Write a protein that binds this DNA or RNA. Structure first.
Ligand SMILES: [Mg+2]
Ligand SMILES: [Mg+2]
Ligand SMILES: [Mg+2]
Ligand SMILES: [Mg+2]
Ligand SMILES: [Mg+2]
Ligand SMILES: [Mg+2]
Ligand SMILES: [Mg+2]
Ligand SMILES: [Mg+2]
Ligand SMILES: [Mg+2]
Ligand SMILES: [Mg+2]
Ligand SMILES: [Mg+2]
Ligand SMILES: [Mg+2]
Ligand SMILES: [Mg+2]
Ligand SMILES: [Mg+2]
Ligand SMILES: [Mg+2]
Ligand SMILES: [Mg+2]
Ligand SMILES: [Mg+2]
Ligand SMILES: [Mg+2]
Lengths: 159, 235, 130, 52, 15, 185, 52
RNA sequence: UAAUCUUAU
RNA sequence: AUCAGGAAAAUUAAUGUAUACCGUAAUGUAGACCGACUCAGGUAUGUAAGUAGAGAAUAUGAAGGUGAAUUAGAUAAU
RNA sequence: AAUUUAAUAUAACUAUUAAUAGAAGGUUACUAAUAAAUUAAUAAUUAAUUUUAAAACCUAAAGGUAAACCUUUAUAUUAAUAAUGUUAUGAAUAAUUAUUAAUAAUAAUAAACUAAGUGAACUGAAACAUCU
């Protein structure tokens, strides 16, 4: 239910001008856990509306459809969320593929080295972020981790 | 009703056939609808299809809030602030000064302070029938530039009088939507960034979540060939 | 009388409107023999036993995993005073799936460390890079 | 439709009055339906017959 | 259209 | 003569499959063993697909009386089961032949010779079976002529080392996979 | 030691005591379920301790 | 009778 | 007794078992199925109160179910 | 400013001529969404070209079946690690979760036109049998 009401009146409902569904771009910069929570809130809202909508259609035989419109809007936001979740995974996969191509990865490492590392006019913080980003090294063991260690050692030697 | 139809999509082909009636038998379809509807409900204007519907604010020549002179009607040469458009009909509902009809109405739909069943109600009217005002009426308006509106929160066009483009007819500033609902997230939380593309090693959303996100047994996603597969194929 | 308002013989049925109709219409769970089993896509869960029983296979049973820390402040709708945001990916043919863009974002993260974007900082903003 | 048994009880909130809620008020749609039935199924001299 | 108008009128009466 | 009922036959032109292209919906399980026979496989006297009929299909024509009362008859070829010796295969191959075909074989001096004649006419009047036989014979002849050297052990030597190297990185490696990897190398 | 139904009952009690699931959770993890459910009004045949 | 053909393992 | 009577799918020990899906209304010697009809036709099985009897014949009828889309009168000839 | 006449629509088929090219249905639901880029030409744009997401079940040919259902188990192994608890003597044996690598899969496909195989009879001959 919503505020323990058998049915939300027109005044109890959120008006159409005040309410908007989520934008895909807005969703794109939200964390996974947050997105998951949002999805479940949406689902809960739909359930509340679905109960109410059913009552309206089955018993009173209305064609007012505000609840239905709300449910549709929520459904739109949900699929947008689903899309951004898929899209993020795909983007990650593409990045992985790009990194797997060796020359491109080497070029990227060189670019990283030139601008921000080994320069003056923070570094440790960058390294710790870079470590997490590119290799499996937080503060467990693998070929990638080893490679990252070697790279770090090389950077230290340079500096 | 006692229906249950609304929790499913049953008899789909039949519904499609009914929904997408041929346009040359549209008078046949609507004749009986007209008969069915009471006088206070029914409208004279044609219910246009969603294809031919003014969705953009360029397609509508006028927005709810702007001041317009009425013509080609009973209440012609009358200024009226347009109250709200009807989406299905492609028409505007004007204020008290616009065109109306006096029709009997049941006590379910009675306004507070009514003696008789008879009530005057505003008829819908097309954008063709009414012209803008600024006092000076505008013959026709054209759109040439565009800009972000502060109040509307959209990249709206510039309403310019036809011929001389510098004479801008400005948009009507809408009413302030004072939002106080439990189902609308506030501006600060709605936009706060909690994700960043950081890791190449760890994937952002877990492996057990993927099946919900996309169909792993998708018939559409064809596999790529290999050398061995080619060799097997070719004699 | 079957119904007292109809005293005389109109061509009305004992029940319903028409006896006849399209017989060729898909079966449901209710129809057919005792042996006719349609099913409703509900239970490819466990395995049927040799004797006629059933044994659930829990690794093939649907759980509905909910986040442990529910962000309740996220709502199904956004406040309409917030404009709908718009991303722009100029200089990236792949768009949001572009690997070059992703690499750039990673580089930015490394340099700065979780800095919020134009849209995230300013609610009045409507267009953005990321 | 799945019934469940639960360890704590529950009773629904009481349905609203016709005057209170806008939507939960079956008089209007039922009246409309009746009017439609009358008008489509009106044949000859029942056009003159006054409406219910 | 009429229904929407009626709703608007009700809202106006309320406020 | 002509080979009308053979050379009229048409088969669906398979598109040339590049290594990087997308798959077809129905790819077969077991690979193609034999080469594609230009003229497919006969779709009329399917009796003749199993043997060396020498392009001799069944005729249909008219039984005609003294009254010239026409009645439909068919004219079958003089087919015969015959186990004939292949020098190349070093075994006798038993098949259905037309008596004519047997005569041709005898004239040419062997069954392998009959199969391997380079003329197009022969190719046409070989069956799908006949084409397969030809392929078997020709391949065998080629093998006889040219043994591989005139590598496997090296692969076998390297395999365990390669597996160990893979394990050291982290992954396991099975032979079949190793073979697949180092076929073109 | 004990029969099957009794074991099941014991398990259920243990789960209740925990505030964990009173039932064996499956492995097929659905993160983003799209299913909705309509809470119905109670019939005469049901109690206050039921919901359909 | 290593022409043909039938049966069984 | 001659008429000579289906087919096919193991046991101890240890470790398990949170128990899936579908059927369930009413009608079914019928107005709810097959007969163009709320059609004296056709339609499978089991209980089928007692008293009587050789009996599931026959009479009655405890209980249950039912008394009907035609009524009221008159009852010539037929 | 309005009316009329003729022509033109996303919104008829048929015949001819000219030009161009060789193309999804149903079922009911946990409804089967999309995102972008570059280029002219007047930031939004329309247009062109290119990329990209999702897309249930059935439609002979994963295996069944009484189409829209059932069963296979790719939210699988197999291995390698890491974290957890138990057994027996720091090493060994099984189970659960989480990464990494390896292993297969989805026929709804036109109809007319063409070529090949087999090939009637009514009918005509004022009969009928060669012939048609
Ligand atoms: Mg019929
Ligand atoms: Mg039945
Ligand atoms: Mg059972
Ligand atoms: Mg029953
Ligand atoms: Mg019962
Ligand atoms: Mg009964
Ligand atoms: Mg009867
Ligand atoms: Mg019937
Ligand atoms: Mg009859
Ligand atoms: Mg008795
Ligand atoms: Mg009685
Ligand atoms: Mg009865
Ligand atoms: Mg009667
Ligand atoms: Mg199929
Ligand atoms: Mg079966
Ligand atoms: Mg032909
Ligand atoms: Mg004749
Ligand atoms: Mg005759």
């Amino acid at each position: 239910f919503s505020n323990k009401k058998f049915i939300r009146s027109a005044d109890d409902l959120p008006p159409s001008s005040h309410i908007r569904p989520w934008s895909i771009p807005e969703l794109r910069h939200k964390s996974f856990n947050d997105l998951h929570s949002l999805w479940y809130n949406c689902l809960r809202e739909q359930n509340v509306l679905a109960r109410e909508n059913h009552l309206l259609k089955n018993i009173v035989g209305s064609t007012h459809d505000e609840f239905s419109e709300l449910s549709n809007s929520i459904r739109t936001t949900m699929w947008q969320i689903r899309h951004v979740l898929n899209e993020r995974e795909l983007a990650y996969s593409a990045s992985r593929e790009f990194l797997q191509d060796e020359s491109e990865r080497k070029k990227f490492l060189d670019t990283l080295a030139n601008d921000y590392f080994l320069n003056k006019d923070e570094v440790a913080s960058m390294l710790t972020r870079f470590q997490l980003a590119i290799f499996g090294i937080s503060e467990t063991v693998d070929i990638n981790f080893i490679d990252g260690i070697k790279f770090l050692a090389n950077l230290k030697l340079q500096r | 009703s006692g229906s249950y139809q609304h929790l499913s999509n049953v008899g789909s082909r039949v519904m499609k056939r009914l929904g997408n009636r041929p346009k040359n038998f549209l008078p046949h379809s609507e004749k009986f609808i007209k008969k069915s509807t009471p006088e206070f409900m029914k409208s004279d204007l044609k219910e246009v299809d969603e294809k031919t519907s003014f969705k953009s604010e360029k397609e509508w020549k006028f927005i709810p809030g702007d001041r317009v002179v009425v013509m080609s009607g009973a209440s012609k040469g009358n200024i009226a602030v347009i109250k709200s458009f009807d989406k299905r009909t492609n028409s505007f509902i004007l204020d008290e000064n616009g065109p109306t009809k006096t029709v009997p109405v049941p006590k379910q739909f009675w306004l507070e302070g009514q003696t008789s069943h008879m009530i005057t109600i505003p008829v819908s009217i097309l954008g063709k029938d009414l012209r803008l005002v600024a006092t000076v009426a505008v013959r026709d308006v054209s759109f040439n530039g565009s800009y972000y509106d502060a109040d509307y929160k959209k990249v709206m066009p510039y309403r310019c009088v036809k011929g001389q483009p510098d004479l801008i007819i400005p948009w009507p500033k809408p009413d302030p939507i004072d939002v106080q609902t439990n189902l609308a997230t506030d501006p600060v939380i709605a936009r706060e960034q909690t994700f960043w593309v950081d890791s190449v090693v760890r994937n952002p959303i877990p492996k057990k979540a993927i099946p919900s996100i996309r169909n792993p047994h998708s018939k559409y996603k064809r596999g790529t060939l290999t050398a061995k597969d080619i060799a097997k194929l070719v004699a | 009388l079957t119904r007292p308002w109809k005293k005389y013989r109109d061509g009305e049925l004992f029940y319903g409107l028409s006896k006849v109709g399209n017989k060729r219409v898909p079966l449901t769970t209710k129809q057919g023999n005792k042996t006719m089993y349609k099913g409703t896509r509900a239970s490819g869960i466990g395995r049927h036993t040799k004797f006629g029983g059933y044994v659930i296979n829990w690794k093939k049973v649907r759980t509905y995993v909910t986040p442990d820390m529910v962000n309740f402040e996220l709502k199904p709708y956004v406040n309409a005073n917030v404009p709908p945001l718009k991303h722009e990916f100029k200089g990236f043919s792949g768009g949001p799936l572009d690997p070059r863009l992703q690499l750039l974002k990673i580089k930015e993260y490394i340099v700065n460390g979780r800095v919020q974007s134009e849209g995230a900082t300013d609610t009045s903003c409507y267009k953005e890079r990321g | 439709k799945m019934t469940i048994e639960m360890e704590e009880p529950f009773i629904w909130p009481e349905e609203p009055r016709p005057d209170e809620n806008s939507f939960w008020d079956s008089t209007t749609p039922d009246n409309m339906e009746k009017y439609r039935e009358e008008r489509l199924n009106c044949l000859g001299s029942d056009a003159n017959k006054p409406g219910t | 259209d009429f229904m929407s108008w009626f709703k608007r009128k009700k809202q106006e009466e309320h406020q | 003569r002509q080979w009308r009922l053979i050379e009229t036959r048409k088969i669906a032109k398979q598109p040339n499959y590049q290594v990087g292209d997308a798959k077809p919906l129905h790819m077969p399980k077991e690979r193609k063993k034999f080469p594609d026979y230009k003229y497919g496989e006969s779709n009329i006297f399917k009796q003749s697909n199993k043997g060396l009929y020498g392009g001799s299909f069944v005729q249909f024509g008219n039984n005609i009386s003294e009254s010239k009362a026409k009645t439909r008859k068919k004219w079958l070829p003089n087919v015969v089961k015959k186990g004939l010796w292949s020098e190349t295969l070093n075994r006798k191959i038993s098949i259905k032949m037309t008596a004519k075909v047997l005569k041709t074989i005898s004239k040419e001096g062997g069954i392998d010779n009959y199969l391997t004649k380079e003329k197009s006419a022969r190719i046409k009047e070989l069956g799908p079976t006949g084409w397969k036989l030809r392929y078997r014979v020709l391949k065998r002849k080629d093998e006889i002529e040219n043994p591989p050297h005139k590598r496997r052990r090296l692969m076998s030597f390297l395999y365990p080392l390669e597996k160990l190297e893979y394990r050291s990185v982290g992954k396991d490696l099975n032979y079949k996979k190793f073979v697949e990897l180092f076929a073109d190398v | 030691d004990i029969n099957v139904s009794e074991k099941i009952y014991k398990w259920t009690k243990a789960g209740i005591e925990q505030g964990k699931e009173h039932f064996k959770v499956g492995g097929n993890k659905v993160y983003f379920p799209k299913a909705r459910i309509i809470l119905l009004r109670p019939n005469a045949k049901h109690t206050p301790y039921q919901a359909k």
